[PDB]
CSV table of C-alpha atoms in Angstrom, one decimal:
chain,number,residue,atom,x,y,z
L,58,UNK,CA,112.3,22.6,73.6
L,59,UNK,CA,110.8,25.9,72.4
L,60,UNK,CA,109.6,26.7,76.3
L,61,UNK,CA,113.4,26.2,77.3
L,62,UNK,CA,115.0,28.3,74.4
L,63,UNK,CA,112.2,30.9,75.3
L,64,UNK,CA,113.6,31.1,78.9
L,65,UNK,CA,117.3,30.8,77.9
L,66,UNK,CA,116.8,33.8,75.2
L,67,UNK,CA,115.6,36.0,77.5
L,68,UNK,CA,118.2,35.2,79.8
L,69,UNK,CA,120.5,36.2,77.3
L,70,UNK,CA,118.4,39.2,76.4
L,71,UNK,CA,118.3,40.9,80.0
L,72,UNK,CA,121.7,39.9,80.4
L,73,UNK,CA,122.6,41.5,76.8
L,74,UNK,CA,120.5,44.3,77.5
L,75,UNK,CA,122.4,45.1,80.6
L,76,UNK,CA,125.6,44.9,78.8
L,77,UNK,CA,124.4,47.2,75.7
L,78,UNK,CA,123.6,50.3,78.4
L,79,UNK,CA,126.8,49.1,79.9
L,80,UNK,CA,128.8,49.7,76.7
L,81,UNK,CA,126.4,52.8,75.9
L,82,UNK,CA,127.5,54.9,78.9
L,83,UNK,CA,131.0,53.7,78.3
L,84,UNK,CA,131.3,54.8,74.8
L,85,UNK,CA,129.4,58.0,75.8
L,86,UNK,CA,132.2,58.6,78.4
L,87,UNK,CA,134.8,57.4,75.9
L,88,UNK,CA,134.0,60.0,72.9
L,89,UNK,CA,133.2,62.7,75.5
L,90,UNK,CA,136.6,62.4,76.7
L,91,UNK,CA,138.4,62.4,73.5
L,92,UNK,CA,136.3,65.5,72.5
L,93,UNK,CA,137.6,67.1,75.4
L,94,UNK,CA,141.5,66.1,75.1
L,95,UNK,CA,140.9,67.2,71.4
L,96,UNK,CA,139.4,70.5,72.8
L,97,UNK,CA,142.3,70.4,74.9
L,98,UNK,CA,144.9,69.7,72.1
L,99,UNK,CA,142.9,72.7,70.0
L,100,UNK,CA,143.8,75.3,72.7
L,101,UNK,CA,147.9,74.0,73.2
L,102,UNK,CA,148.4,74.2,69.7
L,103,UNK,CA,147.0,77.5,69.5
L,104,UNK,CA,148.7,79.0,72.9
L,105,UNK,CA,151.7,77.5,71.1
L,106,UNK,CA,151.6,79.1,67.8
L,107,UNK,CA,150.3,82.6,69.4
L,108,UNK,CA,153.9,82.3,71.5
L,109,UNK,CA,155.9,81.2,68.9
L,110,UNK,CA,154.4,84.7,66.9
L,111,UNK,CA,154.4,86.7,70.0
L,112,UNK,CA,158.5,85.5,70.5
L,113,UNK,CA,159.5,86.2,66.7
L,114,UNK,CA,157.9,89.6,67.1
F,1,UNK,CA,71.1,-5.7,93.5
F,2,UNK,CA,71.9,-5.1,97.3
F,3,UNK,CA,75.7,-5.7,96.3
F,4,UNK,CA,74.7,-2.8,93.6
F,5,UNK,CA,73.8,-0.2,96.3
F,6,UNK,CA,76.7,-1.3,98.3
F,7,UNK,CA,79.2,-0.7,95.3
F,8,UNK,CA,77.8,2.8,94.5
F,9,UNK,CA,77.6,4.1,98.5
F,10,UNK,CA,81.5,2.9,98.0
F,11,UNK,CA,82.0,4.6,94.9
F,12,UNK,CA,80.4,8.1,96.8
F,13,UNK,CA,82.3,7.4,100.0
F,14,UNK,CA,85.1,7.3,97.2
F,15,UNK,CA,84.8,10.6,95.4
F,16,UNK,CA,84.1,12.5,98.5
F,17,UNK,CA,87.4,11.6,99.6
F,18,UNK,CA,88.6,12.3,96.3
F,19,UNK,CA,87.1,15.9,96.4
F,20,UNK,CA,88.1,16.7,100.2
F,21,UNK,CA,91.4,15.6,100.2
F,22,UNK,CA,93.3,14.7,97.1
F,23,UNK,CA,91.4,17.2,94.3
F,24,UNK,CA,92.8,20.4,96.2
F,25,UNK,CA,96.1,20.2,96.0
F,26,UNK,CA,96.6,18.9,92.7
F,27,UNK,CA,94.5,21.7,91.4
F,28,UNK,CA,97.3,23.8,93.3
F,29,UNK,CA,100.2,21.9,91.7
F,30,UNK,CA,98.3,22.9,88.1
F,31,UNK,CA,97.9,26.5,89.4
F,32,UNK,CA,101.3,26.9,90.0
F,33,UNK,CA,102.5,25.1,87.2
F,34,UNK,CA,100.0,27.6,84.9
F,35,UNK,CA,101.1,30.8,86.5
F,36,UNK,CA,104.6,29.9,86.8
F,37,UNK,CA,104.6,29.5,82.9
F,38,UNK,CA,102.1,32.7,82.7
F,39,UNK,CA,104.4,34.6,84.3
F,40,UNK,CA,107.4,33.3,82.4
F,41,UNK,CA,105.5,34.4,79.3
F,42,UNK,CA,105.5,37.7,80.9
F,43,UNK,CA,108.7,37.8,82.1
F,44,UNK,CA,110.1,37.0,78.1
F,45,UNK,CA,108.0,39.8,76.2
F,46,UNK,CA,108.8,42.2,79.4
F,47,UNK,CA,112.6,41.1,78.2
F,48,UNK,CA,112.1,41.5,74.8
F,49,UNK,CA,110.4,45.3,75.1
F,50,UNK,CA,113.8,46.4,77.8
């Protein structure tokens, strides 16, 4: 019994270890791109507000 | 004790067949079985460091 949970385990492990570095890159792509379409958001709102000034002047 | 002698030369002719024939490959089938559980071994902790 111990043998066989031995070898299921680490069929699960490898399998879950797979899927962790899976969901690592993804959440490392994920957070990248919201930095970026924050970045993004950062430098609208400015052009925005410097146009807004520039048209009231 | 003729029937003695007889008995024991069949014994011999017995093991020697034993040994030639039938010892090899179940000394293969308990190879196998010991690496294949060796390596199993392996295979978990190799699992359990990645």
């Amino acid at each position: 019994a111990e043998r066989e949970a031995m070898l299921a385990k680490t069929a699960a492990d490898n399998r879950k270890s797979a899927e962790q570095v899976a969901a690592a890159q993804a959440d490392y792509e994920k957070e990248m791109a919201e930095a970026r379409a924050q970045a993004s958001a950062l430098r609208d709102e400015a052009r925005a507000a410097g146009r807004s000034v520039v048209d009231e002047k | 004790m003729s029937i003695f002698i007889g008995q024991l030369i069949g014994f011999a002719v017995i093991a020697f067949i034993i040994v030639k024939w039938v010892v090899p490959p179940v000394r293969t089938l308990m190879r196998n079985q010991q690496e294949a559980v060796r390596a199993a071994l392996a295979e978990s902790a190799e699992a359990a460091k990645k």
